[PDB]
Amino acid sequence: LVPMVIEQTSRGERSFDIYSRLLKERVIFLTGQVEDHMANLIVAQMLFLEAENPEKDIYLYINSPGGVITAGMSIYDTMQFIKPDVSTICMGQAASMGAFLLTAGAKGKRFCLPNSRVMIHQPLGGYQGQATDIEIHAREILKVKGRMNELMALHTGQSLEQIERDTERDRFLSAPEAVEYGLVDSILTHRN
Amino acid sequence: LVPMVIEQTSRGERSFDIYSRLLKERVIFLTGQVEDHMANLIVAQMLFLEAENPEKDIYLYINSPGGVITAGMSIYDTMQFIKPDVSTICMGQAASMGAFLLTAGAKGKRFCLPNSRVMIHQPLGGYQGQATDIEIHAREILKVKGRMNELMALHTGQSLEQIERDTERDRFLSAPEAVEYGLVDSILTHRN
Amino acid sequence: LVPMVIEQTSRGERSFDIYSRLLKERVIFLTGQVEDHMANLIVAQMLFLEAENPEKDIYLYINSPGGVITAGMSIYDTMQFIKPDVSTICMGQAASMGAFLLTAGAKGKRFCLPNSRVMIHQPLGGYQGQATDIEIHAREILKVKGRMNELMALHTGQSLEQIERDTERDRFLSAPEAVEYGLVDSILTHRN
Amino acid sequence: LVPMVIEQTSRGERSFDIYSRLLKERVIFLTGQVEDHMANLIVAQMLFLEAENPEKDIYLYINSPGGVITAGMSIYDTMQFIKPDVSTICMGQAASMGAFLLTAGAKGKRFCLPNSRVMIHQPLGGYQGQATDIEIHAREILKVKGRMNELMALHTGQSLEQIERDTERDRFLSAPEAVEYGLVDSILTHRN
Amino acid sequence: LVPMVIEQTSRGERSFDIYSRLLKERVIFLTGQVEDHMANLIVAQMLFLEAENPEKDIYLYINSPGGVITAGMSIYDTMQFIKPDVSTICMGQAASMGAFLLTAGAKGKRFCLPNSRVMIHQPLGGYQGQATDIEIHAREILKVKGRMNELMALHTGQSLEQIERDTERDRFLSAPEAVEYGLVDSILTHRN
Amino acid sequence: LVPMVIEQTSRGERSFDIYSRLLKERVIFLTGQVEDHMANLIVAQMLFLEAENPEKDIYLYINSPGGVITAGMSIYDTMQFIKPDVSTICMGQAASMGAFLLTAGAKGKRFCLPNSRVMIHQPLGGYQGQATDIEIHAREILKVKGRMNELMALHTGQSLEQIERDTERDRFLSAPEAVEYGLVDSILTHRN
Amino acid sequence: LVPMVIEQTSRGERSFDIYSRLLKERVIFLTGQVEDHMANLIVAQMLFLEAENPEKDIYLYINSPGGVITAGMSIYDTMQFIKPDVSTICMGQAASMGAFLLTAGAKGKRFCLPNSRVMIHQPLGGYQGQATDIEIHAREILKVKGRMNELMALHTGQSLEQIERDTERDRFLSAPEAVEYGLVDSILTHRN
Amino acid sequence: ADATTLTEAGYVGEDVENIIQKLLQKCDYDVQKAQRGIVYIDEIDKISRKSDNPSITRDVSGEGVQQALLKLIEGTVAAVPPQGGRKHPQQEFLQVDTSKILFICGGAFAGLDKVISHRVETGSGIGFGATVKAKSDKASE
């Protein structure tokens, strides 16, 4: 059950769900396995906030174990299309897609909690059928792997060759290690 | 959980769900597997917006892996029927039906995101029973295959022969490749 | 979920569901497998509209693969009973039961989209038990077959002999072919 | 999703579901297999309407493939117990339990649509256990059979012997056949 | 679905559920299998009505095949404790626990519909475990049997020895048979 | 569904569910298997009611067959913590955990219905794994068993040795037997 | 079902759910298995409360058997970040993560009920695959184990080596034992 | 007169001093005898507040009318215009004292019986331990 909170406004008191109340403050929650349905919801939230104030910065809390690539690209392209700088924060963990979206945030506005755990790996897929069809699908995942590695190098700043070697197998990076790699910019230990 | 947003109006404050708020701005979301129920919902939104303002243009955000053909034709026929031009934007991906609806948009108003993935294939179906019944259903699906190819050639602008060759097996086209093929017109990289 | 819509009236702004809003305009959606529960809902909608304005026509949008005969027959008798004419429009497809309701519409008001597929077949059923019981159920379904063919001939205008031969096996009819057969009257290609 | 209808009066505008709007007009919908829960709901509607007005007639629309006998008797006894005359209209079909409730309606206020199918059969039951217990349960179902036949004969007007022979096995009937048999009084074809 | 109803008051119209509307008239519905959750709901209604008017009687409509004994005893104890006389009514059927609650009603206010079927049987249960545990549980169910028979004899007025013989095996009692047995006071043939 | 009730009082009329209405009167329903979620809810009601009037008593109705021990201690500790005296009443039954909470009530304010049953037994649990881990878990449950017997002896007043012998195996106690044992203080037969 | 309560505010009366009412008083409930979805809900409540009043303390009630390590870290990092002091309380039980979050509370504001239990154990995990990837995942769970033992040592005040010896296998600590160990500061026996 | 027509000062509805104006008509606009007159006020029930109102709306038809009548009933000098006039900075006013003027406010307080029924038979508690000894009785309004 989601709790309801009261907001005091000039017109009068209004009741908001905990997630809607934070949405009003330009906070979007990315949680759980990434998929088409939740991704379109995040996309709608981003576009809605852009119209309200395209100058103020949006925030995207990321606690997810990853998911579909296509659903994630919709969020990534939306973050880059809109004018507001999307400030990504990592809570708990950020897997392949959560990390790709985390590093996709605006330069200087990417953060991670001290005990968060980031992980980056190559795409996962499979196909059953004729040899001809297998070749077709095999080339796509390779292109997706190359396309995702190119973008990671652009945001993190690491060379494309280094990203390939590190992304060949699951690599776990702590919050300080992620700062050196380039996935994040700073760590939020305490409120100053 | 779908978040709720507040819209300021002359009458006063109004509360809308994130999807309904965007519907007010002539935005329809096509997400997930295409089927009879979701298609009828999209049809109802197109007709509703036509009455409100038949001059303004409607937008359709397609992120789907495809689905039933009959359900898609209900959407396609509705788009061509109504006077408003329907602008199709591909987010994440657009499979066989999603791609057919994507290219079916108004000439010049079809868009695609940079990291989107478009795939077009021929219809797939199956029937179990007597040989006589097999001949009936086998002829019907072939007719649909020809009909779908004829419509894609019209929207894309490619020859019918070329479409048959390319759609014989799954073909994946990126956003720039789709522009050349004719499925989409331009790419929305950044807000201008 | 269903998107809410706002309707402007003399009293003020009012909120309506997408389906309920269209119901106010005498539009009923027949979607999915025909069953007793949904059929009684359609029947209730028809009776309600008859009371509001028995002179104005009613528009039934059919996109379904067919279903139970008893449930579908409760809709047919309701359409003929009420004074207002019931216009039938086929979206996507209209199978055996959906086609019977489609052709059962008011003469001159039956319509079909250009890419819709209309399939008609004979009733199918089964029973398990004693030979005496099988004889009872076999005679009943055969009587139903003649009843449906008799009514289909009346609406389409074709002879009973032709309907019996054509419906002996699954027969798929396109929107133009349906016009010649008599299942529908005109094709709504574009709004004029 | 049941649609919502608006009732407009001088006092104001009220929104009701389609089923509740018809309830104000003394229309009760009997749909699906008969059971204790659905039957209890129908009973509550009869008592509520009796309190509002004990003189106005109550309408009952029946479309059901029979069900539990005990649940049906609650509806039947309630109809006879309350002063208002309960009219019965068969939509689609009326099996063993539905037919018993159909013919149980007030004399001269029992109707059926032209294409409705009415089937009557003897009770069905089973018990597993000791021989002594079987005799107890077997005697009970036979008493129920004789009781149901006596009541059906009273409403239909046929002799008890004729009802026993006819109900030994499934006996499908049509709307015209039901009129002569006595299950119904008239057929509603067109509003005139 | 539960149909809502509207009531007219001087302060204004108020929407109520069908069951809630009848609760205002001191009507409680005992339906289905008896269990802890449903029983607690009936207990809460009995206490609520006692506070509103401890002098006005309460009408309990029973239609159930029986259930847990502990849950039923909660209802039975509550009925005796509250000052209002609980007028039990048997709709459809009343099994072992349903009948125990039926006969528990106030003397002279126990009714049964003419076609209802009452049934009384001894408690049934089982335990798996060591012989010592079996002895303990067997003693408890036998005590429950003696306690229930002692109470049934009190309400019915029959001797304890006669109740034991009749309850050894399932005994089906019609409405007239129950009157002479003492389970119910009279039959409700009509409102007048 | 739970039936809604209204309070016709000054300062406007308020509609609440039957359970919430009783909560306003300082009545908490403990029903079904004890678990963390239901126990947490009861804790909130106890803490909530304390704020309005710490002097007024709180009533707890127990019809539970027992459950987890940890969840039960959360309720026991809350009852002893708060200032208002918690009056426990047994409806239907009170098993091992329900009985522990029943006897835990305030001295002189523990009641039981005449036909209610009570049972007390030692804790049951199990662990699968290494012998070293088994010793850890076996020691833990034995400590819990000793702790529970100590508290039960305190409330009931019996010696620790007597409680240990009686709780070795399931012991079923009737309402009068419970009074002698000390689990409850008196019985509520009829309202005075 | 969750009950609803009324609050007597200056601007009339408002209805709140039992959990939302306590949230208004800076009380958050952590119950059940820890996971990403519930953890993101607690984080939202902590941030919302900080905005309302940073000086006032936030109360957290932990009755849980543990869960995902990453989800718990999101809660732990959030507590340390926010300026207000989070006062943890243990009701029923506090397993590995529940204990880690319990001891994570502000020094001097960690409490435990007298009959509560605590359990601390090392992390649990597993992976299936090649030897190379097994070595990778094995290093992280070992690193997570060391990180969790370092933080627990800080709050408890015990040496790191001592925590490792105890956490190697499941350990059960009573409320007084936890005080000596350092997991909690004091016990809440009765209100003073 | 009618209380419903009366409204708080400074609003388009009406003013409470019109009551004296109506009385002045009968007395031939003679304040001396008017001071010894009797007044009747009908439909005073409509002036009551409904419930739990924060007053942010600044209710005029209700609470505002009561606040103005307070000084009038107990007795205070009131400026009454000559005839068919509204209060304004003009000097067209008549000083009338209501100290000796009796007032009889009559209204049909619909719903007051339920309030009385509550207090008399509100009862205490709903459960087994509650005191439901009080029995609701059927009595005329």
Nearest residue, CB atoms, F44 vs list G1, G18, G115: G18
Please name the residue of chain F whose CA is at the shortest distance from the CA of residue H52. F11
Phi, psi of A11 (to 5 degrees): -65, -35
How far is the C-alpha of C148 from the C-alpha of C43, rounded, in Å?
A: 20
Please name the residue of chain D whose CA is at the shortest distance from the CA of residue E21. D48
Nearest residue, CB atoms, H125 vs list F25, F61, F111: F25
Per-residue b/e over D115-135, b at no fewer than 16 CB within 10 Å?
Answer: bbbbbbbbeeeeeeeeeeeee
Residues with Cβ within 8 Å of E41's Cβ and at least 6 positions away in sequence, in order, are F2, F3, F18
Q: Based on the structure, what is the number of domains in chain A?
A: 1
Question: Is position B123 within any domain?
Answer: yes
Contact between G13 and F24 (Cβ < 8 Å): no
How far is the C-alpha of A58 from the C-alpha of A88, rounded, in Å?
A: 9
Question: Is position G192 within any domain?
Answer: no
Residues with Cβ within 8 Å of E184's Cβ and at least 6 positions away in sequence, in order, are E90, E102, E103, E110, E111, E112, E118, E175, E178
How far is the C-alpha of C175 from the C-alpha of C188, rounded, in Å?
A: 10
Residues in chain B: 192
DSSP assignment of E102-156: HHTSPTT--EE-TT-EEEE--------S-HHHHHHHHHHHHHHHHHHHHHHHHHH
Closest CA to F116 of F78, F90, F134, F142: F90
Question: Residue A139: is it exposed, middle or buried by C-beta count within 10 angstroms (0-12/13-18/19+)?
Answer: exposed
- Token duo for residue D130: 């000791």
Q: Which residue has the tokens 């230990």?
A: A189
Which amino acid type is present at position F105? G
Give long-range contacts, CB 8 A cutoff, 24+ apart: C130-135: C132/D169, C133/D169, C133/D170
Residues of F in contact with E4 (CB under 8 A): none
- Please indicate if any CB of chain D lies within 8 Å of the CB of E41: no
Residues of F in contact with E140 (CB under 8 A): 117, 172
Residues with Cβ within 8 Å of D168's Cβ and at least 6 positions away in sequence, in order, are D122
Contact between A88 and A101 (Cβ < 8 Å): yes
Q: Which chains touch F (3 or more CB pairs under 8 A)?
A: E, G, H
How far is the C-alpha of B40 from the C-alpha of C19, rounded, in Å?
A: 10
Residues with Cβ within 8 Å of G167's Cβ and at least 6 positions away in sequence, in order, are G120, G121, G122, G145, G149, G152
Spot the catalytic one: F57, F121, F137, F155: F121
C130: domain CATH number is: 3.90.226.10
Residues of G in contact with H53 (CB under 8 A): 12
Active site residue B57: no
Question: Is position C94 within any domain?
Answer: yes
Write down the experimental method used for this entry.
cryo-EM
| Domain of A21, in residue numbers | 4-187
Residues of E in contact with D142 (CB under 8 A): none
Contact between D118 and D172 (Cβ < 8 Å): yes
Question: Is position E192 within any domain?
Answer: no
CA distances to B143, C61, C65 from C98, rounded to whole Å, are 21, 10, 7
Q: Which chains touch H (3 or more CB pairs under 8 A)?
A: E, F, G
CA A126 to chain centre: 24
Contact between G63 and F40 (Cβ < 8 Å): yes
Contact between A109 and G141 (Cβ < 8 Å): no
Question: Is position G35 within any domain?
Answer: yes
Bridge partner residues of E64 (DSSP):
E94
- Please indicate if any CB of chain C lies within 8 Å of the CB of D23: no
Active site residue B116: no
Which amino acid type is present at position G152? M
Query: Left, alpha or beta for G90 (phi > 0: left; psi -120 to 50: alpha)?
Result: beta
Positive or negative torsion for Cα F154, F159, F160, F166: negative
In 3-state terms chain H splits into helix, strand, coil percentages (rounded to 5) of 30, 15, 55
Nearest chain F CA: its distance from G18 CA (Å) = 7
Q: Which chains touch D (3 or more CB pairs under 8 A)?
A: C, E
Per-residue b/e over F131-143, b at no fewer than 16 CB within 10 Å?
Answer: eeeeebbeebbee
Spot the catalytic one: A17, A36, A133, A170: A170
Contact between C80 and C67 (Cβ < 8 Å): no
Question: Is position C81 within any domain?
Answer: yes
Residues with Cβ within 8 Å of E108's Cβ and at least 6 positions away in sequence, in order, are E185
Phi, psi of C104 (to 5 degrees): -70, -10
Question: Residue A22: is it exposed, middle or buried by C-beta count within 10 angstroms (0-12/13-18/19+)?
Answer: buried
Which amino acid type is present at position H23? L
- Please indicate if any CB of chain E lies within 8 Å of the CB of D2: yes
Question: Residue A162: is it exposed, middle or buried by C-beta count within 10 angstroms (0-12/13-18/19+)?
Answer: middle
- To one decimal, the resolution in angstroms is 2.6
Contact between C111 and C91 (Cβ < 8 Å): no
Per-residue b/e over E4-33, b at no fewer than 16 CB within 10 Å?
Answer: bbeeeeeeeeebbbbbbbbbeebbbbbbee
Please name the residue of chain B whose CA is at the shortest distance from the CA of residue A150. B115
Please indicate whether, in this complex, the C-beta atoms of B191 and A83 are within 8 angstroms of each other.
yes
Question: Is position F33 within any domain?
Answer: yes
- Please indicate if any CB of chain D lies within 8 Å of the CB of C76: yes
Nearest residue, CB atoms, F170 vs list E136, E144, E147: E136
Contact between D64 and D96 (Cβ < 8 Å): no
Nearest chain A CA: its distance from B51 CA (Å) = 24
How far is the C-alpha of A21 from the C-alpha of A4, rounded, in Å?
A: 9
How far is the C-alpha of E52 from the C-alpha of E24, rounded, in Å?
A: 10
Question: Is position F147 within any domain?
Answer: yes
Please indicate whether, in this complex, the C-beta atoms of D36 and E92 are within 8 angstroms of each other.
yes
- Please indicate if any CB of chain E lies within 8 Å of the CB of H85: no
Q: Which residue has the tokens 């529940």?
A: G98
Nearest residue, CB atoms, F18 vs list E44, E81, E83: E44
What is the β-pairing status of strands D4-8 and D13-17? antiparallel
- Please indicate if any CB of chain G lies within 8 Å of the CB of H99: no
In the 3-class helix/strand/coil scheme, how is C84-121 assigned residue by residue? CCEEEEEEEEECHHHHHHHHCCCCCCCEECCCCEEEEC
Nearest residue, CB atoms, H127 vs list F10, F12, F59: F59
How far is the C-alpha of C31 from the C-alpha of C75, rounded, in Å?
A: 13
Longest dimension (CA), chain C: 67
